[PDB]
Amino acid sequence: SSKNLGGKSPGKRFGIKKMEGHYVHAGNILATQRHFRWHPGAHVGLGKNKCLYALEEGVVRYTKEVYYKTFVHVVP
Amino acid sequence: GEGWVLGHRYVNNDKLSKRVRKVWKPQLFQRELYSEILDKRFTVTVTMRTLDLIDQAC
Amino acid sequence: KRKTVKAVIYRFLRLHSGLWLRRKAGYKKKLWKKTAARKRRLREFVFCNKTQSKLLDKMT
Amino acid sequence: SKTILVKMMSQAGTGFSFNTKRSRLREKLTLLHYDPVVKKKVLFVEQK
RNA sequence: GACGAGCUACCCAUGAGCAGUUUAAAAGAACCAACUCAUCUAUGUGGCAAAAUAGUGAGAAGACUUGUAGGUAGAGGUGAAAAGCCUAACGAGCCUGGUGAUAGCUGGUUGUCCGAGAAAGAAUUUUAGUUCAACCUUAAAAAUACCCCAAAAAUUCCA
RNA sequence: CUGACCGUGCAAAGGUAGCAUAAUCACUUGUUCUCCAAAUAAGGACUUGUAUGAAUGGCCACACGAGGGUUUUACUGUCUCUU
RNA sequence: ACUAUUCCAAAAGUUAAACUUAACAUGGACUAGCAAUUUCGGUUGGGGUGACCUCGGAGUACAAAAAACCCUCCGAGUGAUUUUAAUCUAGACAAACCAGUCAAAAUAACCCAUCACUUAUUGAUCCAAAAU
């Protein structure tokens, strides 16, 4: 009866795993996102899936800059 | 070791398939010999191949 | 007496502490499109979960 | 055209890699690739 | 694995039975008692009877009816062939044994008191069933957890 | 109006005799005629036969039928309508 | 298993210095007509029919996740061009099981990337093979 056909796609749970003020560790996943919602800041690495991670031990901090970019930093 | 030998039969002789029991009976033919001790001609219906051994037993 | 399941005995290894060890699946075929790192980490071992480790323990 | 799966073999006689090629192409693939045994880049030729 | 053709179906062997009337030679035709069947209607419906009775109707010298002595049985027999019959229910008899077959189903599962106390995450030749999560209970330890304002991204976090 | 005739596509070859709203016809209670004061049934014809057909035979046929249908007469508690 | 065959054997003859015949009964494979064992999905506004079954993206599913219907739009079982992904140590995301992502840093030798909007584009066991 239904001519149209489509499937369902399981969620990959995109989002931010950590928050500002939290104490993280080196190698920990910060934010999993599609394309760029935000940009990597100091002491923060970029992945192939565009997922930002922490390079060294420290504290996560969010900072907005307009020259329109959003950077995430890790302060040891 | 000949008379009434009942084995099993398979298709490809490697069985993931059905196994069906099969009957095997020996061949029977007439063999005429002569016994000098009893002074009598004897008739044996017994095993063919065995006679080949008897010929070597003389 | 109880009969241990051989299916568990072959592909699993129990330590003296009761820890279970198994090989990582997926290395057997279709490695052409797979990354060498994936295969490298699939050639190593891995410890089973306690819930399943207990089940495999009862069979040994 | 179709897809053909082949391997990259060093002159040492053992293929260290496996790749694909287009069926439209005929001549065997010849490409420089790193060899972990001799620990240096050697020229690899296409093999089955 | 055996018991069953004293019921019934067919057949073998050996016997018996089928008034009377019109009629040209006619065991020849038609009608009609016995006998063999069960067309229609009614009655009977834990019955007179687990196949009936009453009226009526068919065959009634023929492919007829019947006695006695025999033969053919279930991975079959028989069947003027209906999926009928083979001891009152045969899509394949009955008895015994395998056998306490298998049943995720349905119908069931017995004294007192106390504390705590469940309604849905993904899969499955799966949806009336299972396997670990979402919960819960017992008995011990090491931790801490929540309600959570402004620093920030209805919430996600934290005094 | 219809198409003896002609042209054309296709197929191994394209239903001849006879029959036909039939144990067959969906439309359908086809149309016409007979039967009845009225006939979706019945009988007799017509044929665009959805979806007859010549030994799973075709078309008829005297006699025969506890088979399946239709119309007059005769006689009746079937019925008016029961006592 | 039964009814009929093709060959080689059992049983009989033939030449030269390796080949031909089947009366009865009995074999090994083999070719046909007969017979012997079971299977016969799920989803489903009952079932059947039809349609669908795994995966990816955009809405339904308003400012971190996730969330159904036989709701609604499009896409895949790959296509192509150039350089080539060598060994392993931390530490995390997601996660019932099993499968999936990111990756500082060390060593040996040099000094993956673009299109099909950005991502899809596959398959867990046991058993076979070019050869390890």
Side-chain angles (χ1 to χ4, degrees):
Chain A
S1 180
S2 180
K3 181 59 180 181
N4 302 324
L5 176 61
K8 58 180 181 181
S9 60
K12 284 78 179 61
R13 293 88 217 270
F14 287 95
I16 326 180
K17 305 304 176 180
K18 300 302 179 180
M19 296 269 82
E20 177 179 358
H22 182 266
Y23 190 84
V24 295
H25 300 269
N28 297 20
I29 295 300
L30 298 181
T32 304
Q33 51 177 342
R34 295 183 177 182
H35 301 269
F36 291 147
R37 297 185 59 88
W38 311 275
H39 294 172
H43 302 272
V44 165
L46 226 177
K48 181 189 178 186
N49 61 334
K50 308 303 180 180
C51 175
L52 311 184
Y53 63 92
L55 290 173
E56 295 86 18
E57 192 84 22
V59 185
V60 185
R61 178 185 178 182
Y62 299 157
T63 302
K64 55 180 180 180
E65 297 180 1
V66 174
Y67 295 91
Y68 304 95
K69 303 176 181 179
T70 304
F71 296 99
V72 178
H73 312 272
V74 173
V75 179
Chain B
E2 287 199 354
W4 300 345
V5 170
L6 313 94
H8 297 67
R9 184 179 178 176
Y10 314 96
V11 183
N12 304 328
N13 304 329
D14 50 87
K15 24 82 180 180
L16 297 180
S17 302
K18 308 168 181 175
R19 160 189 60 182
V20 187
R21 50 186 182 178
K22 185 177 179 181
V23 291
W24 277 287
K25 304 176 182 179
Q27 303 179 1
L28 300 179
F29 293 94
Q30 178 180 0
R31 172 61 62 179
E32 181 178 0
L33 205 60
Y34 187 84
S35 60
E36 58 178 0
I37 304 180
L38 193 60
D39 195 30
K40 174 186 176 182
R41 48 181 179 180
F42 196 85
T43 299
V44 243
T45 329
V46 300
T47 294
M48 297 295 99
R49 301 302 179 183
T50 296
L51 306 170
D52 301 330
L53 299 181
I54 303 179
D55 294 330
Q56 301 178 359
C58 179
Chain C
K1 53 182 178 180
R2 304 178 304 171
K3 311 195 176 182
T4 62
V5 180
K6 287 300 173 61
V8 180
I9 308 300
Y10 276 104
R11 31 206 168 187
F12 297 99
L13 179 60
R14 179 182 180 181
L15 298 180
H16 193 75
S17 299
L19 183 59
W20 285 96
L21 191 65
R22 65 167 187 178
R23 191 182 191 178
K24 272 295 187 59
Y27 112 100
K28 287 168 178 168
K29 57 181 178 180
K30 298 185 179 183
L31 304 179
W32 94 98
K33 199 178 181 180
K34 294 184 178 180
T35 315
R38 299 181 179 180
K39 178 184 178 181
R40 178 186 297 104
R41 294 187 172 182
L42 286 182
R43 287 183 61 179
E44 299 181 0
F45 311 95
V46 62
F47 60 95
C48 304
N49 298 328
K50 182 180 60 180
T51 302
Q52 294 175 325
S53 300
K54 182 181 181 182
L55 181 60
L56 299 178
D57 202 329
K58 295 182 178 180
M59 301 178 183
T60 301
Chain D
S1 59
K2 297 181 179 180
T3 298
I4 303 180
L5 300 181
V6 293
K7 61 181 179 179
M8 301 180 61
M9 180 181 298
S10 63
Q11 305 165 349
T14 301
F16 299 99
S17 180
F18 297 87
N19 208 330
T20 177
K21 76 171 189 180
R22 185 176 185 177
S23 180
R24 179 182 179 180
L25 301 181
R26 292 191 174 184
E27 302 178 2
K28 299 181 180 181
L29 300 181
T30 305
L31 292 175
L32 291 169
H33 185 270
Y34 181 82
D35 177 30
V37 175
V38 77
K39 295 182 179 180
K40 89 168 190 177
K41 300 180 180 180
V42 198
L43 186 67
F44 281 64
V45 293
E46 173 187 335
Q47 293 291 340
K48 300 180 180 180

